[PDB]
Design a protein around this ligand. Structure first.
Ligand SMILES: CCCC[C@H]1CN(c2cccc(OC(F)(F)F)c2)C(=O)CN1Cc1cncn1Cc1ccc(Cl)cc1
Ligand SMILES: CC(C)=CCC/C(C)=C/CC/C(C)=C/COP(=O)(O)OP(=O)(O)O
Ligand SMILES: O=S(=O)(O)C[C@H](O)CNC1CCCCC1
Ligand SMILES: O=S(=O)(O)C[C@H](O)CNC1CCCCC1
Ligand SMILES: O=S(=O)(O)C[C@H](O)CNC1CCCCC1
Ligand SMILES: [Zn+2]
Lengths: 316, 487
């Protein structure tokens, strides 16, 4: 049975403060007794700006019932820093919140603030935790964004070694091996290989990257993630489309496609036709490009009939 | 008007091919294809003259959806305490949906909406997700509260608009406390930084006449660096140092929700007459990314939120509603170097009517996909996207010109006092030119004569929302006119 906080010895000095909604608010929520009681006492705690262990315990009670309560998370972090609490202990509590499926923008941001303030000399333990946490949801958007932030922040401090970057690409390659359609992992590859400030840009690296992209397309010809990475790659580095056309042309009917294509690969592949059309434009052959856009519009990608007609009209 | 918007029932439905390479992504995709295509198979084609016998009728069940929303003006069960910090969003989702559905609130209920929201307004600036004695201000409830007051308030002494006007300086000061040197904003004290905050802040600052140069510095650069190699936008960009970063890098994958916020933010900044501002985006790439997210006929022509994930009705607003913005930016660039619909306006309505409505005779409401319960958020965003598909929206240069011609720069509320001494406009000529451009462009969206497409007949028609703002034009115009003292 629940024991109200008014009957708790540790809280006898505190006068709770009711929620000030007005007399007849719209969108009211039918709160449980436990949640209203805790918020009644949080309002009093926050009003007197009390920084204490009982206030800390009260914030944990509240965010367990509502992990999206940004105000109580903000108060919790100021309690931790004001009381000089162990931030490694708090990080272990956050590990449990994930286990028990307590999650929100607010929890992820709490974890980031902890890592920022701890400021470890080597963040490898947090990197490995993030990697493991992605196995229930390998496309969790908050998690991927947090991983980007962690490497960006600690590389700015000079704390990501060449060995660490190398094993991060190894891990990324394994994610894409297990599911080549994971667009989140393709985004991470782009950070590791192209966008991060420390990336190498050489004749060798451009050759390697192109090899990996084309192999990926030949493994899964209908994978939109691989086509988009190819187009972004060529565009980012101002590389011509035409010299690569031999690897693409078999899908319109360096690594080359399998002599018999994989089964369950109906032709043509619409984004292969987009490649061909754009390569025609690169050759200034607008009429040939227009004919490809017309076929995309009327037969091969009809959901986008209007967009492909727009593209056709630009050329004619 | 439909030569290039083929109906989903007129196209061959086929699964995404496997290439003999199974994966978890494909398992989920194929299962969702089966769910959506079977519901379409059970439903009469909305484009038929006489509805088929034995099959479900797809007409928009507006009265069911009204009854679904009516809970808000009574109460919500306890299991939605997870939204206790988002009560202004519960208001907005409800009252904007009712506007779209053409259902009026009586004045007593509108006054309850106004009064509730004003209890969320903190004297030091901004709205929280609940009572000001319980929650600190936050950029996202501030957008939801301001837009809700546009929908439910008025210019009288009990209408809430005069309280907003009196709060302009404090709201501005909250916005400036949120600002980072690199051009991002935290959403609240100690909160996260992403383009949802930028979007919500720029909408409110545009509407309330509180934009200054110090508020906007680097905001364009933060947003532009969110664009990814796929052409959409991520949640945020990271500034590598040495206010003057050496470079900025996007922090996650292109996503429908952040692409909407980024396109809308950038569009609002193009109104501001600052030198070499806003930094450009790749509009062609953004338009390409947008149209590529509309699903195949087997998945009902709804939008997905990112590559190789599942279609979901709420992206009808986030991605569909970004299309007119991307289109206008492309049009500007095409001209600056000197028409068929850009997405399948018919298929998107079919997804809304056939897949996104709750099954008939039930709770009502609209949802993510079949098999998911409807909620207020998917109700609002399905209907907002349906509106964009039904009505051809464009930003009209001649309308903007006419707006400039009628603007009265001698009328207005007190200028905001900047935080830093040099943070304001240089002089009145420049401030008034800024007010004129920002007001005149905010009122530049039109529905094109003869561009209407109402799949299934005119009883399915809903009202016309505005791109960027997502409130009805009949709400936007008197609201923004109030704060700029125009009439
Ligand atoms: C019945 C609740 C719907 C949850 C939905 C929306 N929601 C949210 C909550 C408050 C304000 C708010 O603001 C808005 F303006 F509505 F965005 C949004 C969430 O927190 C997670 N959501 C889950 C989702 C359903 N379909 C796609 N998603 C993913 C997603 C969408 C939006 C956001 Cl922000 C985060 C994740
Ligand atoms: C103004 C404002 C608040 C804009 C926000 C709009 C919006 C849709 C944001 C989505 C953010 C996000 C991380 C979605 C992915 O969640 P998910 O993995 O559950 O869904 P998914 O599979 O569709 O990506
Ligand atoms: O939201 S809607 O589906 O348009 C409206 C509901 O279906 C109402 N159903 C009929 C009401 C009149 C009597 C016979 C049933
Ligand atoms: O505007 S001011 O009145 O100076 C400051 C806020 O209003 C106070 N609201 C607090 C929010 C968090 C819980 C305790 C109250
Ligand atoms: O205006 S038109 O588009 O020509 C045709 C009407 O809107 C048809 N609406 C239906 C009428 C019978 C009940 C179910 C709705
Ligand atoms: Zn959704």
């Amino acid at each position: 049975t629940y024991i109200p906080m008014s009957q708790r010895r540790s809280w006898a000095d505190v006068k709770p403060i009711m929620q000030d909604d007005g007399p007849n608010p719209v969108v009211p929520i039918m709160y449980s007794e436990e949640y209203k009681d805790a918020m009644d006492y949080f309002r009093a705690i926050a009003a007197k700006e009390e920084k204490s262990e009982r206030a800390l315990e009260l914030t944990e009670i509240i965010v367990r019932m509502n992990p999206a309560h940004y105000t109580v998370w903000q108060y919790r972090f100021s309690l931790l820093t004001s009381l000089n609490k162990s931030l490694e202990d708090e990080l272990r509590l956050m590990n449990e919140f994930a286990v028990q499926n307590l999650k929100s923008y607010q929890v992820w941001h709490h974890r980031l603030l902890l890592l920022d303030r701890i400021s470890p000399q080597d963040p490898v333990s947090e990197i490995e935790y993030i990697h493991g946490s992605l196995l229930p949801d390998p496309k969790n958007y908050h998690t991927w964004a947090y991983l980007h932030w962690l490497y960006s922040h600690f590389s700015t401090l000079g704390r990501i070694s060449e060995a660490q970057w190398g094993s991060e690409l190894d891990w990324c390659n394994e994610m894409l091996r297990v599911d080549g359609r994971n667009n989140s992992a393709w985004g991470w590859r782009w950070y590791l290989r192209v966008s991060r400030p420390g990336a190498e840009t050489s004749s060798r690296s451009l050759q390697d990257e192109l090899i990996y992209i084309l192999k990926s397309i030949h493994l899964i010809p209908h994978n939109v993630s691989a086509w988009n990475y190819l187009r972004g790659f060529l565009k980012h580095f101002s590389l011509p489309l035409v010299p690569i056309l031999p690897a693409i042309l078999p899908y319109t009917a360096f690594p080359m496609p399998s002599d018999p294509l994989p089964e369950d690969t109906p032709l043509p592949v619409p984004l292969a036709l987009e490649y061909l059309a754009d390569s025609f434009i690169e050759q200034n052959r607008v009429d040939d490009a227009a004919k490809v856009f017309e076929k995309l519009s009327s037969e091969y990608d009809q959901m986008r009939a209007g967009y492909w007609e727009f593209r056709r009209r630009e050329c004619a | 008007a439909t030569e290039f918007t083929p109906s989903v029932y007129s196209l061959v439905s086929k699964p995404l091919p496997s290439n003999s390479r199974p994966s978890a992504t494909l398992d989920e995709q194929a299962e969702t294809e089966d769910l959506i295509s079977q519901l379409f198979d059970l439903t009469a084609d909305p484009n038929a003259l006489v509805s088929e016998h034995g099959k479900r009728y797809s007409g928009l069940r507006k009265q069911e959806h009204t009854q679904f929303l009516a809970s808000s003006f009574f109460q919500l069960p306890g299991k939605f305490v997870s939204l206790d910090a988002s009560r202004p969003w519960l208001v907005f989702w409800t009252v904007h949906s009712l506007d779209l559905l053409g259902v009026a609130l009586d004045q007593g209920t509108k006054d309850r909406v106004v009064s509730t929201l004003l209890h969320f307004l903190s004297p030091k600036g901004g709205f929280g997700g609940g009572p000001a004695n319980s929650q600190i201000p936050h950029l996202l409830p501030t957008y939801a509260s301001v837009c809700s007051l546009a929908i439910a308030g008025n210019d009288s002494s009990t209408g809430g608009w005069k309280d907003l006007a009196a709060a302009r300086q404090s709201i501005y000061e909250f916005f400036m406390r949120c600002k980072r040197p690199d051009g991002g904003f935290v959403v609240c004290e100690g909160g996260e930084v992403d383009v949802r905050g930028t979007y919500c802040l720029l909408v409110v600052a545009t509407l309330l006449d509180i934009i200054t140069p110090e508020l906007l510095h680097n905001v364009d650069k933060f947003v532009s660096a969110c664009q990814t190699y796929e052409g959409g936008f991520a949640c945020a960009s990271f500034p590598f140092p040495s206010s003057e970063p050496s470079c900025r890098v996007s922090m996650a994958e292109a996503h429908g929700g952040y692409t909407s916020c980024s396109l809308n933010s950038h569009f609002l900044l193009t109104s501001v007459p600052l030198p070499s501002f806003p930094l450009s985006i790749d509009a062609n790439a953004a338009l390409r990314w947008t149209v590529l997210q509309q699903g195949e006929p087997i998945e009902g022509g709804g939008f997905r939120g990112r590559t190789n994930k599942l279609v979901d009705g709420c992206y009808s607003w986030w991605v569909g509603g970004g299309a007119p913005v991307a289109e206008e930016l492309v049009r500007r660039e095409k001209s600056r170097k000197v028409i068929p619909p850009i997405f399948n306006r018919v298929a998107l309505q079919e997804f809304t009517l056939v897949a996104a409505q709750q099954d008939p005779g039930s709770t009502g409401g609209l949802r993510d996909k079949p098999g998911k319960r409807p909620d207020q958020y998917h109700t609002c965003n399905n209907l907002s996207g349906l509106s964009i598909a039904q009505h051809k929206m464009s930003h009209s240069p001649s309308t903007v010109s006419s707006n400039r011609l009628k603007f009265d720069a001698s009328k207005g509320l007190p200028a905001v006092k900047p935080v830093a001494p040099g943070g304001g406009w240089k002089n009145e000529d420049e401030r008034q030119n800024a007010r004129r451009e920002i007001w005149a462009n905010a009122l530049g969206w039109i529905e094109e004569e003869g561009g209407e497409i109402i799949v299934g007949g005119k009883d399915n028609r809903i009202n016309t929302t505005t791109p960027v703002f997502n409130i009805l034009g009949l709400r936007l115009k008197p609201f923004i006119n109030y704060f700029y003292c125009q009439e």
